[PDB]
Design a protein around this ligand. Structure first.
Ligand SMILES: Nc1nc2c(ncn2[C@@H]2O[C@H](COP(=O)(O)OP(=O)(O)OP(=O)(O)O)[C@@H](O)[C@H]2O)c(=O)[nH]1
Ligand SMILES: Nc1nc2c(ncn2[C@@H]2O[C@H](COP(=O)(O)OP(=O)(O)O)[C@@H](O)[C@H]2O)c(=O)[nH]1
Ligand SMILES: [Mg+2]
Lengths: 12, 201, 426, 141, 428, 12, 12
C-alpha cells in the first residue's frame, strides 16, 4: 500500500 | 506521569503546558512534546484550601513546610483509631521547634454535606471542600479507593483508606506512609515523615 | 509455556471439578460464554496453564470429562459455567459401572479407555511442552475408582517422567455410602502408591466438620462442599499461574515434601474460613492464620494431627504480606509444637508466597502436609476390608468378572506394609 | 477540529490537533464485547504505560476507533482506555474504518500511520506480537 | 577497556539484581528507558545515540520472574534475549539444574557472554549472584561457573551467595543444595561473600526500626553494598581499590576466600535527626557484631583480613584515627601472622538512596568485607543439618533418578569437613 | 516503579 | 509543655 515517504537529507 | 498518567490532574497539566509551549513557539527552537521538568503546574486553585474559622488561602502559603495529603472518612473505624494519634503527631512536631514544620491537607469520603462537617469540627488542619471537583480528581490521582467504584486504568489500588502521603513541589508523590499499603502497620507510620526532604517549593 | 491437563472422573469427581472450573474461571475473569472481562494483565499473562485458544477469541479448558454414567455430565452441561467444555473431550458411558470397581476396571474398562486416551494425547502434544496431570476422582465409587485408575495407568506408561497428582476423596469412617468402600478404596490404593507422584486425601465428613464448626453452617450443599475443596485446589497451582516474591511449582512441592517414593499422601487444609460470626471482628493477619493450618478442626481430612507428627509441612500463602513472619511464625509454631514434629528433619516447614490473593480476599494460605496422622484412615479401611474376607462375601461378583482371589491378598500385603513403613519411621 | 478527544473526568477536553508532533501515532480498532479484543485492550495499555512514560519525552500515542453498536457502550470503554479517542458522532470514525479495509474476527488491529495520513504499518492479534512496533519509526516533523 | 559483567541466576538473584539496577540507574542519572537527559562505561555500553545498555545475563529455568521483569517498567532497559528463561523450574533440585534441564540453556548463556565480554578488551571480573538453597539458583549457577572457569582463567570471579539461615528456612532441601554445591563452588570461584537471611533480617529490625519489610526492601539494603564495592571503579576516589586487588590483599590463602559484608549506617529519618554520623562511630557500628550480614558473631571469632571502603567527604586524617581506635580496642582480635589487617579506601561520591524507600541519605558510609575464622560456625550448622538428613538416606530417591549417583554426597561431605578443618590451622 | 533522578548539582 | 525561651542574657 502507500507507504509514507522517508524524510530527506538534513543538508549538512 | 508521577505517580500515574491516567489521572485528571495530569491530563490538564500537560494540556495547559503544551498549549503554553506551542503558543510561545508560534509567537517566536523548542522540542515537542516537552519534558516533565519543563511541565509546571499550579496544583491547588484559589478557593480550595481553608483553615479553622473557614477562611480561604492560596497555594503560596504552603512554602517552606512539609505538606501531607490525608485520605480519610468518618465511617471507617481505622480512621477513628488513627485520627487522635494524627492529632498528637501534628501536635508534638509543630510546637516543638521554631518553625511550622508540618502541615496536613485533608480530603474526605464522607457520604453527604453533613458528614464532612462532623469530621471537620474535630480537625484543625487544612482541608478542601467536597463540593468542588478538586476532591475526586485528587482521589484518582494518588490511587486511593475505599472500594472499586470508579473504573481504574489498569492500576490496582496500592493504598486504602486511611492513607496519609507526603508530596513535593509539583504534585509529586514522595513516599507512602504505610498505614494502609501492601505493608499495613497501624498508628506508627506517622513518625516516618521526613520533613527535610518533603518540601513545597 | 507449561500447561496442566485436567482429567475429571466419577460422579463425585465430575461435580468436584465442575466447581473447580466454576471457581478458576470467575477468578481469572472469564464469563461462562467464554469471553473475558477484568482488564488486568495478571489474569491473562498465564491463561494457557488451564485454557486453550479457540481462534474465536474464547478459552476452552483443557479438561476431560469422563464417566460411565451419562447423567453426571448431563448435569454439568445444564449447570452454570456448563458451556466451557468441548463436547469432543466428553466420553460417555451407557452400560454403567454400578458402584463396582471390578466391572469399571476391566469389562467396560476397555472400550472407553481407548477413547479417553485418544482425547488426552491430542490435548497433550498439541501444546509445546506440558507440565502435569491433575485428576479429580473418588476412591469410594466404582467408575471413579476403577475406570479413572486405569486412566492413571495408561497416562504414566506413555509419560513416565511428568508430574501428576490426584485430588481424590476417600471412604468415610462414620457415615458411609456405597457399601463396597474398602473394596473400591484398597484395590485402587495399590495403583496409587506405585503409579502416582502425589495423592491428596479428602474425607467427606471431615468436610462436614469444616462446615459445622469452623463455618457455622446449618444446611450446606455440594456446591459449598466442593467450593472449599476447590479453594485449596486453586491454591496449589495459583502460584504457578501467577508471579510472586517466592514462586512455586507442583514439582517444587514434590521434591521437598515427599521424602521417599512410596509415601506421598498429603493433608490439605485451607485458611481463612469465616462465618457471619467469624468475619466482622476477626483480624486477618499472618499470626492469626498460623493457627488455622495447625488446627484439627480446620482440616479437610479425618486424620487427627495430634495423633501423629508432621514429616514435612508446607504452605502456599497469597496476598500483600511480608514474607518473614511467614517463617518466624513457622519457626515458633515449630518450636512450641516440637513434640508435634519429627525430630530427624531440621526445619521441616516449607514456605512460598504468591503475589495474587484469592479474589475478593486480602490474604489466604493453602496447607499441604506429609504426616503420620494418615494411618487412622488407612487402618479403618484395612480392618473393614478384613471383615469382608473371612467369610468370602460380596466378591463372588468380582470373581465373575475376572477379579479372582489372587490379587486381593497382596492388596493387603502391600497395605499393611504401607502402614508398617509409616509406623517404623516414628 | 473537535473530532479527537482527550480524556478528562467531569468534562471531555478536545485535544488540539497538532498534539501528535514527534510521536508515533497508532490507530487501535476495537469493538466492545468482542472476545479477542478483551485480552488485547489491557496489554496494549501495558505498552502505553511502560514505553511512553519511562522517559520525559513522549514516544507513542494511540487514537481509539470504536466499532461499537451502542453509544453508551462506547462511553464505558472510552472511560477504560487511557488513550484518546474519536467521538461517536464524528465524521472521522466511519471515514477511517472505510479507508483502512477493516470490516465489521479480524478485529482488533493496530495500524501505525504517518504525518501525511497514509498507512505506515499493520499488525494483527489473531492467534510478543505487540512488541514489534518501534516508537522511533514514525517520528513526526 | 577495563569493565565488569554481572551474571544473575535464580529468582533470588533476579530480585537482588532488580534492586541493584534500579539503584545504579538512579546513581548514574540514566533513565529506565536508557537515555541520559564517562563513568557509565564500566557498567553500560553506548549502543548507538545516547542509549546506555547494561551488561548482564539473567538465567532462570523458572520463567515467571523473567517474563515478569519483561512485563515490568524496565523492559527497554534490558536487552530482551539475555533474559533467557527455561520452560520449567529445577524445583529445588541440585540434580535437575545441573544435568537435564541445564544443558539446553547453559549453551545459550555461554555464547552470550562471549559477545558481551569482547565488547571491550582487558576485562576484570564477574558479579555472580545466586541463591545456594535452591535448585536452579545453585545448579545452573554452578553449571555456569564451571564453564566460565575453563574458558576464562584470568578473571576475578566474585560470587555473592545467599547462604541459608539456621532457623529461617523457606525450604527443606537446602541442607542438600548447599553442602553438595560447596564442593563444586570452592575450587571454581575466586571471591565469595556470605549473605545469610536472618542476619540482614535483624539488621532492618533494630537499625531501620521496621517490624516487617518485604524481600525487595532488603534487596535495596543489599544493593547499597553492591554499589560502593564497585563505586571505586565507577567514580574516582582519594584512594581507590578495585576488584583486581582483592586477590593481593583480602585473601591470605587461596582456599579460604569466603568473607563477610557490612554496611553502615543503615538508618532512616528517625535516626538522621539525632546523630552526627562521623567516621569514628561509623566504623564502630560497622564493626558491631550484630551488623554482620551472616549471624557470624566474632566474639569467638578471630580476624585475619579486612577492607573498609568509605565514601562521602571523608578525609584520611581521621581515617587513620578511626582504625587506630579499633586496633587498640580489645573486643576485636586480629591474627598474629599479619601485623596489620586493615586496608582503607575513599570515594568522593556520597551514596544515593532510592526515593520512596527506607534509607534516608547519609553524607558518610562504609562497606566492610572481612575474612574471619568464625566462618566455621556458618558451615557447622550446615554440617549438623546435612548428616541428620543423610543418616537414613533421606530425600535422595529422586536425586539418584536424575544423575546424583551414590558417592558425590559423601565426597562433598569430607570436603565441607575439609573446609571446617581448613579454618583451625589458619587460626592456630 | 518509575523513579526520579537525583539533581546533578553543578560544580560541587 | 513547649516552654518559652528566656532572654539570652543581655551583656556588654
Ligand atoms: N536475598 C534474597 N534471597 C532470596 C530471595 N528470595 C528467595 N531467596 C532465597 O533463595 C533461597 C532459595 O532459592 P529460591 O528463591 O527458591 O530460587 P532458586 O535458587 O532459583 O531455586 P528454585 O526455587 O528451584 O528456582 C531461599 O532459601 C531464600 O533464602 C530474595 O528476594 N532475596
Ligand atoms: N464432596 C463430594 N462428595 C461426593 C459428591 N458426590 C458423591 N460424593 C461422595 O462419593 C460417594 C459416592 O461416590 P459416587 O459418586 O457414586 O462415585 P461413582 O461410582 O463414580 O459414581 C458418596 O459416599 C459421597 O459421599 C460430590 O459432589 N461432592
Ligand atoms: Mg525459581
Amino acid at each position: 500500500v502507500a507507504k509514507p515517504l522517508p524524510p530527506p537529507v538534513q543538508t549538512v | 506521569s508521577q505517580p500515574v498518567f491516567a489521572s485528571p490532574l495530569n491530563v490538564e497539566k500537560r494540556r495547559l503546558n503544551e498549549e503554553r509551549a506551542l503558543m510561545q513557539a508560534q509567537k517566536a527552537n523548542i522540542q515537542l512534546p516537552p519534558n516533565y521538568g519543563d511541565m509546571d503546574l499550579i496544583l491547588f486553585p484559589e478557593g480550595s484550601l481553608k483553615n479553622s474559622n473557614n477562611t480561604v488561602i492560596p497555594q503560596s502559603h504552603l512554602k517552606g513546610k512539609s505538606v501531607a495529603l490525608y485520605f480519610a472518612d468518618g465511617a471507617d473505624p481505622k480512621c477513628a483509631s488513627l485520627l487522635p494519634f494524627l492529632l498528637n503527631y501534628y501536635r508534638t512536631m509543630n510546637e516543638g521547634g521554631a518553625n511550622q514544620k508540618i502541615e496536613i491537607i485533608f480530603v474526605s469520603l464522607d457520604r453527604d454535606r453533613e458528614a464532612f462537617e462532623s469530621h471537620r469540627a474535630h480537625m484543625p488542619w487544612l482541608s478542601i471542600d467536597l463540593e468542588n471537583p478538586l476532591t475526586e480528581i485528587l482521589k484518582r490521582h494518588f490511587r486511593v479507593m475505599k472500594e472499586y467504584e470508579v473504573p481504574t486504568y489498569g492500576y490496582g489500588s496500592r493504598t486504602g483508606v486511611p492513607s496519609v502521603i507526603v508530596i513535593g513541589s509539583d504534585g509529586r508523590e514522595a513516599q507512602f506512609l504505610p498505614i494502609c499499603s501492601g505493608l499495613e502497620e497501624g498508628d506508627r507510620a506517622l513518625l516516618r515523615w521526613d520533613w527535610r526532604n518533603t518540601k513545597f517549593a | 509455556m507449561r500447561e496442566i491437563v485436567h482429567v475429571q472422573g466419577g460422579q463425585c469427581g465430575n461435580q468436584i471439578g465442575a466447581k473447580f472450573w466454576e471457581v478458576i474461571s470467575d477468578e481469572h475473569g472469564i464469563d461462562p460464554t467464554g469471553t473475558y472481562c477484568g482488564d488486568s494483565d495478571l489474569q491473562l499473562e498465564r491463561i494457557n496453564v488451564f485454557y486453550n485458544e479457540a481462534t474465536g477469541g474464547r478459552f476452552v479448558p483443557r479438561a476431560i470429562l469422563m464417566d460411565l454414567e451419562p447423567g453426571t455430565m448431563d448435569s454439568v452441561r445444564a449447570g452454570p459455567f456448563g458451556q466451557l467444555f468441548r463436547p469432543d473431550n466428553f466420553v460417555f458411558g451407557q452400560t454403567g459401572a454400578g458402584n463396582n470397581w471390578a466391572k469399571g476396571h476391566y469389562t467396560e474398562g476397555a472400550e472407553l479407555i481407548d477413547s479417553v486416551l485418544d482425547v488426552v494425547r491430542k490435548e497433550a502434544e498439541g501444546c509445546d511442552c506440558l507440565q502435569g496431570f491433575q485428576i479429580t476422582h473418588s476412591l469410594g465409587g466404582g467408575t471413579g475408582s476403577g475406570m479413572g485408575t486405569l486412566l492413571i495407568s495408561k497416562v504414566r506408561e506413555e509419560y513416565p517422567d511428568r508430574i501428576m497428582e490426584t485430588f481424590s476423596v476417600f471412604p468415610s469412617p462414620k457415615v458411609s455410602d456405597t457399601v463396597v468402600e474398602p473394596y473400591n478404596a484398597t484395590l485402587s490404593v495399590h495403583q496409587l502408591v506405585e503409579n502416582a507422584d502425589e495423592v491428596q486425601v479428602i474425607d467427606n465428613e471431615a468436610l462436614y466438620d469444616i462446615c459445622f464448626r469452623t463455618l457455622k453452617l446449618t444446611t450446606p450443599t455440594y456446591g459449598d462442599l466442593n467450593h472449599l475443596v476447590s479453594a485449596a485446589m486453586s491454591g496449589v497451582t495459583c502460584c504457578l499461574r501467577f508471579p510472586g516474591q517466592l514462586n512455586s511449582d507442583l514439582r517444587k512441592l514434590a521434591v521437598n515434601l515427599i521424602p521417599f517414593p512410596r509415601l506421598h499422601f498429603f493433608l490439605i487444609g485451607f485458611a481463612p474460613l469465616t462465618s457471619r460470626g467469624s468475619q466482622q471482628y476477626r483480624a486477618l493477619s499472618v499470626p492469626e492464620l498460623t493457627q488455622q493450618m495447625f488446627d484439627a478442626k480446620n482440616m479437610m481430612c479425618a486424620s487427627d494431627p495430634r495423633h501423629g507428627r508432621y514429616l514435612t509441612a508446607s504452605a502456599m500463602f497469597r496476598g500483600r504480606m511480608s514474607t518473614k513472619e511467614v517463617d518466624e511464625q513457622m519457626l515458633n509454631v515449630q518450636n512450641k509444637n516440637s513434640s508435634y514434629f519429627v525430630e530427624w528433619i531440621p526445619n521441616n516447614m516449607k514456605s512460598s508466597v504468591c503475589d495474587i490473593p484469592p479474589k475478593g480476599l486480602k490474604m489466604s494460605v493453602t496447607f499441604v502436609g506429609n504426616s503420620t496422622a494418615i494411618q487412622e484412615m488407612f487402618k479403618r479401611v484395612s480392618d473393614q476390608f478384613t471383615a469382608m474376607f473371612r467369610r468370602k462375601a460380596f466378591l463372588h461378583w468380582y470373581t465373575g468378572e475376572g477379579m479372582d482371589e489372587m490379587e486381593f491378598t497382596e492388596a493387603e500385603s502391600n497395605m499393611n506394609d504401607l502402614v508398617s513403613e509409616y509406623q517404623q519411621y516414628q | 477540529p473537535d473530532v479527537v478527544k482527550r480524556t478528562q473526568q467531569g468534562n471531555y477536553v478536545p485535544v488540539r490537533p497538532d498534539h501528535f508532533a514527534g510521536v508515533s501515532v497508532a490507530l487501535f480498532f476495537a469493538k466492545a464485547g468482542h472476545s479477542k479484543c478483551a485480552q488485547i485492550v489491557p496489554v496494549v495499555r501495558q505498552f502505553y504505560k511502560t514505553t511512553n512514560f519511562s522517559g520525559e519525552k513522549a514516544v507513542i500515542e494511540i487514537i481509539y476507533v470504536s466499532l461499537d453498536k451502542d453509544e453508551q457502550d462506547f462511553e464505558r470503554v472510552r472511560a477504560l482506555m487511557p488513550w484518546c479517542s474519536v467521538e461517536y458522532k464524528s465524521c472521522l470514525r466511519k471515514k477511517l474504518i472505510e479507508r483502512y479495509r477493516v470490516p465489521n474476527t479480524a478485529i482488533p488491529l493496530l495500524i501505525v500511520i504517518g504525518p501525511n495520513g497514509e498507512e505506515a504499518g499493520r499488525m494483527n492479534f489473531q492467534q510478543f506480537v505487540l512488541q514489534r512496533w518501534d516508537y522511533r519509526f514514525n517520528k513526526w516533523p | 577497556m577495563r569493565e565488569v559483567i554481572s551474571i544473575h541466576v535464580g529468582q533470588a538473584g533476579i530480585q537482588i539484581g532488580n534492586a541493584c539496577w534500579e539503584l545504579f540507574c538512579l546513581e548514574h542519572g540514566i533513565q529506565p528507558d536508557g537515555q541520559m537527559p564517562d563513568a557509565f562505561n564500566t557498567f553500560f555500553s553506548e549502543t548507538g545515540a545516547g542509549k546506555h545498555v547494561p551488561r548482564c545475563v539473567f538465567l532462570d529455568l523458572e520463567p515467571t520472574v523473567v517474563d515478569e521483569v519483561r512485563t515490568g517498567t524496565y523492559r527497554h532497559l534490558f536487552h530482551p534475549e539475555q533474559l533467557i528463561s527455561g520452560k520449567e523450574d529445577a524445583a529445588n533440585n541440585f540434580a535437575r539444574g545441573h544435568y537435564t534441564i541445564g544443558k539446553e540453556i547453559v549453551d545459550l548463556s555461554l555464547d552470550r557472554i562471549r559477545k558481551l565480554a569482547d565488547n571491550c578488551t582487558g576485562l576484570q571480573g564477574f558479579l555472580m549472584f545466586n541463591a545456594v538453597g535452591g535448585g536452579t539458583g545453585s545448579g545452573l549457577g554452578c553449571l555456569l561457573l564451571e564453564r566460565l572457569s575453563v574458558d576464562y582463567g584470568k578473571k576475578s570471579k566474585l560470587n555473592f551467595c545467599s547462604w541459608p539461615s539456621p532457623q529461617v528456612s523457606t525450604a527443606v532441601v537446602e541442607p542438600y543444595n548447599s553442602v553438595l554445591s560447596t564442593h563444586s563452588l570452592l575450587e571454581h570461584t575466586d571471591v565469595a561473600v556470605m549473605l545469610d537471611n536472618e542476619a540482614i533480617y535483624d539488621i532492618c529490625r533494630r537499625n531501620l526500626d521496621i517490624e516487617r519489610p518485604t524481600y525487595t526492601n532488603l534487596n535495596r539494603l543489599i544493593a547499597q553494598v553492591i554499589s560502593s564495592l564497585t563505586a571505586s571503579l565507577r567514580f574516582d576516589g582519594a584512594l581507590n581499590v578495585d576488584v583486581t586487588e582483592f586477590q593481593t590483599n583480602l585473601v591470605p590463602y587461596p582456599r579460604i576466600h569466603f568473607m563477610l559484608s557490612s554496611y553502615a549506617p543503615i538508618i532512616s529519618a528517625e535516626k538522621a535527626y539525632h546523630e552526627q554520623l562521623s567516621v569514628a562511630e561509623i566504623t564502630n557500628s560497622a564493626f558491631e557484631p550484630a551488623s554482620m550480614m551472616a549471624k557470624c558473631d566474632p566474639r569467638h571469632g578471630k580476624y585475619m583480613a579486612c577492607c573498609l571502603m568509605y565514601r562521602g567527604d571523608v578525609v584520611p586524617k581521621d581515617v587513620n584515627a578511626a582504625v587506630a581506635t579499633i586496633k587498640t580496642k580489645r573486643t576485636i582480635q586480629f591474627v598474629d601472622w599479619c601485623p596489620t589487617g586493615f586496608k582503607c579506601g575513599i570515594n568522593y561520591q556520597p551514596p544515593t538512596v532510592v526515593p520512596g524507600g527506607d534509607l534516608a541519605k547519609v553524607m558518610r558510609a562504609v562497606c566492610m568485607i572481612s575474612n574471619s575464622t568464625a566462618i566455621a560456625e556458618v558451615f557447622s550448622r550446615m554440617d549438623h543439618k546435612f548428616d541428620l538428613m543423610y543418616a537414613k538416606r533421606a530425600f535422595v530417591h529422586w536425586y539418584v533418578g536424575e544423575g546424583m549417583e551414590e558417592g558425590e554426597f559423601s565426597e562433598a561431605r569430607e570436603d565441607l569437613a575439609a573446609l571446617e578443618k581448613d579454618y583451625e590451622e589458619v587460626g592456630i
